[PDB]
Amino acid sequence: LPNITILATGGTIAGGGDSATKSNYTVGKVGVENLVNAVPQLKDIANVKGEQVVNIGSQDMNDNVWLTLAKKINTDCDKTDGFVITHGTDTMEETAYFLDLTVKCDKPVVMVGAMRPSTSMSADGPFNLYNAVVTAADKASANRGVLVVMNDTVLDGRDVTMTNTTDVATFKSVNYGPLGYIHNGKIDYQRTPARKHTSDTPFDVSKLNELPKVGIVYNYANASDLPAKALVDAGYDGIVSAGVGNGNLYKSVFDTLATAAKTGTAVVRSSRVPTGATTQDAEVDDAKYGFVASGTLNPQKARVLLQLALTQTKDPQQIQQIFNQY
Amino acid sequence: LPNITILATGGTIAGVNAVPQLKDIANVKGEQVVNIGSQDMNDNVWLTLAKKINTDCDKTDGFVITHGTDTMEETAYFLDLTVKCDKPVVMVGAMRPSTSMSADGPFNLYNAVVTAADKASANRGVLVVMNDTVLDGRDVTMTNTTDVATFKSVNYGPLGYIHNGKIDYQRTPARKHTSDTPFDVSKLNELPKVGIVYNYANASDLPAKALVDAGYDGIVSAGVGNGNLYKSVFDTLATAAKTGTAVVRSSRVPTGATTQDAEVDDAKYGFVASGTLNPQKARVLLQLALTQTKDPQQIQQIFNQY
Amino acid sequence: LPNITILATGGTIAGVNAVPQLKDIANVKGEQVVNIGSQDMNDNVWLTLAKKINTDCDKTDGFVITHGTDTMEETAYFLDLTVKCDKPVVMVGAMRPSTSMSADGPFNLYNAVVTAADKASANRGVLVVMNDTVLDGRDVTMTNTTDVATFKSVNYGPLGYIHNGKIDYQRTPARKHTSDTPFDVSKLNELPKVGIVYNYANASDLPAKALVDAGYDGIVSAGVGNGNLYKSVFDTLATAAKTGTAVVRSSRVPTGATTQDAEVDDAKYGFVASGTLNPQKARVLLQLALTQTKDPQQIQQIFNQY
Amino acid sequence: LPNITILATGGTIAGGGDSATKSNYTVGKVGVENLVNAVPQLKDIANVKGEQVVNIGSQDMNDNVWLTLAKKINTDCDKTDGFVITHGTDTMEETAYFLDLTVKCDKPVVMVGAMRPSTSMSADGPFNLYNAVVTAADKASANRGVLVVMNDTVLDGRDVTMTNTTDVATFKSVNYGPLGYIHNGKIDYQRTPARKHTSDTPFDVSKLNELPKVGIVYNYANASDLPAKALVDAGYDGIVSAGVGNGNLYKSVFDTLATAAKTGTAVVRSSRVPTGATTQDAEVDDAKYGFVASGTLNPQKARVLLQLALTQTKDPQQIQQIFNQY
Ligand SMILES: N[C@@H](CC(=O)O)C(=O)O
Ligand SMILES: N[C@@H](CC(=O)O)C(=O)O
Ligand SMILES: N[C@@H](CC(=O)O)C(=O)O
Ligand SMILES: N[C@@H](CC(=O)O)C(=O)O
């Protein structure tokens, strides 16, 4: 059977509360060993080996843990047949895209979490973790980029996102759909991401100590410019706008970001709306302002790529093409 | 036929006399309140709107507000809390330009008037009418950046559907709206200042710090997951909450409630959970909450009733 | 604590004492009505169920029926029309086996009892509780073949959501249910025979002809699109409708209403449109309709009220 | 500019009523010329040429019009750059899969319809037809199988289905998602169907006068066996079961179909549930009864493939593998 390495980072999957029937819980508590041992059918499918990288709620996820992950995967690739990453749900979609863009290891990387704590009634984490291992074990799982496996479904790291605050079925690829569904330890793959991932990207984080500073500002009625001016004041390399409708900006925020674009700060228009693309050739003349439209990337996802794009270039045409390729 | 007033505010739907069939169903009069893209919607326009409706209630049988799509869901919930008129107030926009192939606005307009003119639309609170669907102003939101079908009530579903100029209503909002709220805006010309801050991995506390240093009355967090806060942001908001800033935890996730009794002790920090109100909606309620009270506990009870 | 009765009927959820925490919230007693996979659910079981509930109403504070997922949506709507008891009747199943990794049944059961035991669950009609959600028995249906999240109220949304053993209710069904229906099943031991036929390109009229030649009391069509009929099937049903067979046009499409005033003159052929009732749900109502009347017009008014 | 051939078959796209504001209408009325001329921007993107094959509502769609379509496309391929097929909505998802399995022409085939009649206020048909032509005109549209284009979205012929009786946004690929979204006459493709289509299939309808007879039976509580016995009585080559939950059968229907399988009639278990697969290795021992599980194919779609499978083989193992390949 295949050798699978579990890289644990915390999350509710490793979370606990004092009642099986109360919602209250704390994160970053339980070690990887408890998790493996809570799925004594893992023996049937793989030779599992658990390593604890960090133990944090993914709400406190950060650039350094991302860097740690990518270098460790890229370093350890020759040592295992596959990777599963146990992680909190909240920022799983950010980390999954980060690794999707930066892992060069040609073996599957499957992220997994849980929407109920390990201690809860009908906790979702055991079966999720099993299906993660199945997916990382499956030869057909290779050359699909970095994956998330939640609720019996294999979802590509780019499109994958939370749709609901609490639903075990929360994770969906809301724009282009899942890669495959899982039944009885077997996967019927009908799709693969077309945008470039993993070893077909330029992004090489092996020698990086940090990542460019990119912030996110929200739009809404009577929006303040003070958040945008804060980030510009602090010399942020990039700002992503979580726009209204199709990436549109409140006039005060617009004005601030327009000025910023012209002094070298990279500016990406995304949208606070949960599906569909922030397009070029709508209400914002991007070329004029030196803005970038995010396409289907939501604000937190557009942040990931803009940060990586800023390790290669500061030219907004080069960054726009990156946002059309990756 | 009923008398129906259009209150125009701009939006893509204007960019009456193109829809001659409205004569079949109502006597309409149009009145320009403002003319702006709703990405630039603001407190003053909202205040004008609520006041106008409240004042002109008796003089018409229902209201249709033409509006941009970008922020219609916000203007909708504001009016849903502030309109005291018991006659239908119906909002409508268009996702395609007035001059484009298969423009949605005409039939959208048509159906908004059908809804405004239906006696059973009464006492359901302020409504959004888009894509043959009647949607309550609290839960209504955009789902897609460009889809004509974008407006959905994503947590509790629509009030009804519109076919052949009739509506089969199957639901009404339970949360208190319009004349059952204590919010009264008739004497106000500014609203408490309330900002939104975004959470994500390695989130800067800079936005939150900048609203705190401006003396904002409230801050809505667009949390990760079930309304969770990146550590720097958590730290800044925890301070804000005891230093005279109201603090609502909402979510960047498009559906489900930001709940109490998960990972954050709201009571200890003095925070409020938004329930199913997304960050822009939680803002609206928060502004109006702040006209009644500054106590977190009292603000939590408002977020629980409305 | 309230008294809550489980009425067991089989299903995957059994394949009480595994859920010791139910003692925290109720005093339960269990009673085996039948033990079958719900793919074999039938009229007799339905009749037993309605009678049992109606009779034992006064003796308990609410009801939880454990059931297969396959046809729970049918049993749900049957009971929603026939239960006269005003106390909560809550249905629950499980999409994963009782012995499987992360089985859903325990917490499903738990939450069904929370719902059965909530005083605000009263007078909302018969309910399905699945995946932390309360769902009205009329609109509730499967969306997915294996997903734990499969049960949704696909046209009008859920009644509420369940978190930390409390429900925030935001909606109630408007269509008349339970004690507001004229259906009374207390003296019946068979139901009018009603069949379903499927439409698609080059559809055979053979199924429809075979139910007609058996003297069926009704036929539900699973139409294409907005309840449209392949020509052969149309021809057979048109004949049936004037020869003493009730004919309801529903749709194979999972959402939206099968409407009047589209391409079919229902009045001319003597047909009924199902509105939002899918074919299996339209069947239920049709059966009960046929215990009151055989006139199409009267049957259309029932499909419009319930 | 590209040469595009419009093959008209009727539908509401070519439907009309006497009021712009009433729902009533009749189908199979308006010719292809009115349609082209109702989109006077078609000039900007292609040299269009309209041919009327039939003029029917798609509720009266049938095997012979399918056969006509496939032979005509396969015959005329060298004469145009692309095909658009105007068709009713109701059975578009059946015809799109039929052609997906039987077109050998290596140029795009794009189906399009409309949920409001041509005469209606804000009728959807003009813009749909424009986006159909854009899609058929796009070089990137090739090697994706037969497509449907509705509401600004490009959907693969296999997964595409109606989700709502009346919504202009009704058509979705409910299991695996769309191929691409359309903005301002341009398409950003991120997916292609993995299952075998067009010239990578065995199905060759060039010399076929008819198709094997396959019927569909519905399951529900207290289901009658009389529909199933009718089709078996008439010597049907195949029966598809629109099962309950995961392809399950009411015991009377089961019994009839079990008997039928054993006397040579092909039997496919599908599901009346609108998403997710009818799986092997659940509550039905398929191998034992000589049944076939449909996977993600819904009843009407499983009918299409079972009919084509029955032009090649009657062996239920061969048909099961076809249902795993196509
Ligand atoms: N806050 C948790 C939520 C979860 O994992 O379910 C996390 O993302 O770490
Ligand atoms: N930006 C426009 C979008 C629209 O209405 O379609 C507005 O909201 O004013
Ligand atoms: N066939 C089973 C499916 C389940 O309950 O999960 C039943 O309905 O009895
Ligand atoms: N019955 C029509 C419906 C439509 O096209 O909108 C058809 O499929 O032909």
Side-chain angles (χ1 to χ4, degrees), chain B residues 9-31:
Chain B
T9 70
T12 294
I13 196 159
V16 185
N17 285 225
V19 190
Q21 291 69 26
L22 288 188
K23 297 178 192 92
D24 304 345
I25 56 182
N27 310 301
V28 342
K29 155 171 78 164
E31 298 192 83

mmCIF file of all heavy atoms in Angstrom, chain B residues 9-31:
data_model
loop_
_atom_site.group_PDB
_atom_site.id
_atom_site.type_symbol
_atom_site.label_atom_id
_atom_site.label_comp_id
_atom_site.label_asym_id
_atom_site.label_seq_id
_atom_site.Cartn_x
_atom_site.Cartn_y
_atom_site.Cartn_z
ATOM 1 N N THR B 9 -33.576 56.383 -8.479
ATOM 2 C CA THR B 9 -32.285 56.726 -7.848
ATOM 3 C C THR B 9 -31.048 56.535 -8.774
ATOM 4 O O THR B 9 -29.912 56.716 -8.346
ATOM 5 C CB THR B 9 -32.075 55.885 -6.564
ATOM 6 O OG1 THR B 9 -31.842 54.511 -6.908
ATOM 7 C CG2 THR B 9 -33.259 55.978 -5.641
ATOM 8 N N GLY B 10 -31.290 56.182 -10.032
ATOM 9 C CA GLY B 10 -30.246 55.765 -10.990
ATOM 10 C C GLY B 10 -30.133 54.266 -11.205
ATOM 11 O O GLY B 10 -31.149 53.547 -11.242
ATOM 12 N N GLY B 11 -28.890 53.790 -11.347
ATOM 13 C CA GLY B 11 -28.610 52.389 -11.669
ATOM 14 C C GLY B 11 -28.610 52.108 -13.161
ATOM 15 O O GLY B 11 -28.922 52.984 -13.977
ATOM 16 N N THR B 12 -28.253 50.874 -13.513
ATOM 17 C CA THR B 12 -28.182 50.442 -14.913
ATOM 18 C C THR B 12 -29.553 50.397 -15.627
ATOM 19 O O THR B 12 -29.622 50.638 -16.836
ATOM 20 C CB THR B 12 -27.433 49.094 -14.995
ATOM 21 O OG1 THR B 12 -26.059 49.304 -14.592
ATOM 22 C CG2 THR B 12 -27.463 48.493 -16.395
ATOM 23 N N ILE B 13 -30.639 50.160 -14.882
ATOM 24 C CA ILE B 13 -32.020 50.147 -15.434
ATOM 25 C C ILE B 13 -32.473 51.429 -16.189
ATOM 26 O O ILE B 13 -33.489 51.397 -16.933
ATOM 27 C CB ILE B 13 -33.039 49.865 -14.308
ATOM 28 C CG1 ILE B 13 -34.400 49.446 -14.864
ATOM 29 C CG2 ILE B 13 -33.209 51.068 -13.364
ATOM 30 C CD1 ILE B 13 -35.252 48.698 -13.856
ATOM 31 N N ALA B 14 -31.780 52.549 -15.921
ATOM 32 C CA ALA B 14 -31.919 53.810 -16.661
ATOM 33 C C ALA B 14 -30.566 54.243 -17.247
ATOM 34 O O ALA B 14 -29.922 55.184 -16.759
ATOM 35 C CB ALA B 14 -32.482 54.905 -15.756
ATOM 36 N N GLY B 15 -30.154 53.546 -18.300
ATOM 37 C CA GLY B 15 -28.903 53.822 -19.007
ATOM 38 C C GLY B 15 -28.628 52.791 -20.098
ATOM 39 O O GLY B 15 -28.837 53.049 -21.294
ATOM 40 N N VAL B 16 -39.913 54.603 -17.888
ATOM 41 C CA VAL B 16 -41.348 54.336 -17.791
ATOM 42 C C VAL B 16 -41.963 54.165 -19.179
ATOM 43 O O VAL B 16 -42.631 53.174 -19.435
ATOM 44 C CB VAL B 16 -42.104 55.458 -17.047
ATOM 45 C CG1 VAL B 16 -43.569 55.081 -16.856
ATOM 46 C CG2 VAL B 16 -41.455 55.758 -15.698
ATOM 47 N N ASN B 17 -41.704 55.140 -20.053
ATOM 48 C CA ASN B 17 -42.278 55.217 -21.407
ATOM 49 C C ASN B 17 -41.755 54.148 -22.391
ATOM 50 O O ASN B 17 -42.281 54.031 -23.509
ATOM 51 C CB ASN B 17 -42.052 56.628 -22.010
ATOM 52 C CG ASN B 17 -42.974 57.694 -21.414
ATOM 53 O OD1 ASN B 17 -43.544 58.504 -22.145
ATOM 54 N ND2 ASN B 17 -43.100 57.719 -20.088
ATOM 55 N N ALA B 18 -40.726 53.390 -22.002
ATOM 56 C CA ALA B 18 -40.323 52.187 -22.759
ATOM 57 C C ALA B 18 -41.168 50.960 -22.403
ATOM 58 O O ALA B 18 -41.069 49.905 -23.052
ATOM 59 C CB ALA B 18 -38.858 51.881 -22.527
ATOM 60 N N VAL B 19 -42.001 51.086 -21.376
ATOM 61 C CA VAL B 19 -42.787 49.970 -20.855
ATOM 62 C C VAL B 19 -44.248 50.440 -20.871
ATOM 63 O O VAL B 19 -44.849 50.668 -19.835
ATOM 64 C CB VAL B 19 -42.283 49.556 -19.448
ATOM 65 C CG1 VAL B 19 -42.922 48.260 -19.017
ATOM 66 C CG2 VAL B 19 -40.755 49.387 -19.460
ATOM 67 N N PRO B 20 -44.824 50.591 -22.078
ATOM 68 C CA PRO B 20 -46.196 51.049 -22.184
ATOM 69 C C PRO B 20 -47.249 50.154 -21.528
ATOM 70 O O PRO B 20 -48.309 50.665 -21.161
ATOM 71 C CB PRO B 20 -46.428 51.187 -23.696
ATOM 72 C CG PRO B 20 -45.397 50.350 -24.336
ATOM 73 C CD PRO B 20 -44.267 50.183 -23.378
ATOM 74 N N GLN B 21 -46.924 48.874 -21.298
ATOM 75 C CA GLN B 21 -47.863 47.909 -20.724
ATOM 76 C C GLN B 21 -48.126 48.130 -19.257
ATOM 77 O O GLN B 21 -49.085 47.571 -18.747
ATOM 78 C CB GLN B 21 -47.410 46.444 -20.886
ATOM 79 C CG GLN B 21 -47.412 45.888 -22.304
ATOM 80 C CD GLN B 21 -46.348 46.518 -23.177
ATOM 81 O OE1 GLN B 21 -45.328 46.997 -22.671
ATOM 82 N NE2 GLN B 21 -46.591 46.545 -24.491
ATOM 83 N N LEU B 22 -47.276 48.890 -18.561
ATOM 84 C CA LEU B 22 -47.571 49.292 -17.169
ATOM 85 C C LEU B 22 -48.964 49.959 -17.018
ATOM 86 O O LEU B 22 -49.648 49.754 -16.006
ATOM 87 C CB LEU B 22 -46.501 50.232 -16.632
ATOM 88 C CG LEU B 22 -45.094 49.717 -16.287
ATOM 89 C CD1 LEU B 22 -44.317 50.826 -15.588
ATOM 90 C CD2 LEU B 22 -45.099 48.502 -15.386
ATOM 91 N N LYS B 23 -49.402 50.685 -18.048
ATOM 92 C CA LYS B 23 -50.807 51.213 -18.096
ATOM 93 C C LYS B 23 -51.881 50.117 -17.912
ATOM 94 O O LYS B 23 -52.966 50.380 -17.387
ATOM 95 C CB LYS B 23 -51.069 51.970 -19.403
ATOM 96 C CG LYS B 23 -50.213 53.218 -19.587
ATOM 97 C CD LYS B 23 -50.482 53.898 -20.924
ATOM 98 C CE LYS B 23 -49.436 54.952 -21.234
ATOM 99 N NZ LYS B 23 -48.301 54.406 -22.013
ATOM 100 N N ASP B 24 -51.577 48.888 -18.332
ATOM 101 C CA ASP B 24 -52.498 47.758 -18.152
ATOM 102 C C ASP B 24 -52.803 47.453 -16.689
ATOM 103 O O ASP B 24 -53.883 46.930 -16.371
ATOM 104 C CB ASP B 24 -51.919 46.491 -18.796
ATOM 105 C CG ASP B 24 -51.594 46.668 -20.263
ATOM 106 O OD1 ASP B 24 -52.063 47.658 -20.885
ATOM 107 O OD2 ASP B 24 -50.870 45.811 -20.790
ATOM 108 N N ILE B 25 -51.849 47.781 -15.810
ATOM 109 C CA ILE B 25 -51.858 47.376 -14.390
ATOM 110 C C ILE B 25 -51.822 48.502 -13.357
ATOM 111 O O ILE B 25 -52.197 48.269 -12.199
ATOM 112 C CB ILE B 25 -50.691 46.408 -14.038
ATOM 113 C CG1 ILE B 25 -49.312 47.006 -14.397
ATOM 114 C CG2 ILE B 25 -50.948 45.070 -14.691
ATOM 115 C CD1 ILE B 25 -48.067 46.138 -14.156
ATOM 116 N N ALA B 26 -51.373 49.688 -13.739
ATOM 117 C CA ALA B 26 -51.333 50.808 -12.778
ATOM 118 C C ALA B 26 -51.346 52.160 -13.419
ATOM 119 O O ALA B 26 -51.158 52.283 -14.641
ATOM 120 C CB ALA B 26 -50.128 50.691 -11.849
ATOM 121 N N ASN B 27 -51.580 53.176 -12.575
ATOM 122 C CA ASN B 27 -51.325 54.570 -12.906
ATOM 123 C C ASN B 27 -50.092 54.983 -12.147
ATOM 124 O O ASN B 27 -50.136 55.163 -10.911
ATOM 125 C CB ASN B 27 -52.486 55.465 -12.513
ATOM 126 C CG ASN B 27 -53.792 54.916 -13.037
ATOM 127 O OD1 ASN B 27 -53.965 54.748 -14.259
ATOM 128 N ND2 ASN B 27 -54.667 54.532 -12.122
ATOM 129 N N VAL B 28 -49.035 55.182 -12.903
ATOM 130 C CA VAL B 28 -47.750 55.459 -12.338
ATOM 131 C C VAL B 28 -47.452 56.943 -12.473
ATOM 132 O O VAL B 28 -47.912 57.611 -13.411
ATOM 133 C CB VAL B 28 -46.609 54.567 -12.931
ATOM 134 C CG1 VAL B 28 -47.151 53.323 -13.644
ATOM 135 C CG2 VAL B 28 -45.653 55.328 -13.832
ATOM 136 N N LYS B 29 -46.686 57.448 -11.515
ATOM 137 C CA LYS B 29 -46.037 58.772 -11.648
ATOM 138 C C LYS B 29 -44.605 58.528 -11.269
ATOM 139 O O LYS B 29 -44.391 57.798 -10.296
ATOM 140 C CB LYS B 29 -46.652 59.818 -10.701
ATOM 141 C CG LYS B 29 -45.719 60.975 -10.314
ATOM 142 C CD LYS B 29 -46.398 62.109 -9.568
ATOM 143 C CE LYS B 29 -46.623 61.768 -8.099
ATOM 144 N NZ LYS B 29 -46.934 63.005 -7.319
ATOM 145 N N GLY B 30 -43.657 59.150 -11.995
ATOM 146 C CA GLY B 30 -42.204 59.068 -11.676
ATOM 147 C C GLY B 30 -41.640 60.342 -11.047
ATOM 148 O O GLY B 30 -42.134 61.444 -11.298
ATOM 149 N N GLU B 31 -40.636 60.178 -10.188
ATOM 150 C CA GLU B 31 -40.035 61.292 -9.430
ATOM 151 C C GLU B 31 -38.566 60.944 -9.213
ATOM 152 O O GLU B 31 -38.289 59.853 -8.693
ATOM 153 C CB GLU B 31 -40.693 61.471 -8.049
ATOM 154 C CG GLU B 31 -42.187 61.819 -7.998
ATOM 155 C CD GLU B 31 -42.626 62.254 -6.597
ATOM 156 O OE1 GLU B 31 -42.431 63.430 -6.260
ATOM 157 O OE2 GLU B 31 -43.161 61.432 -5.818
#
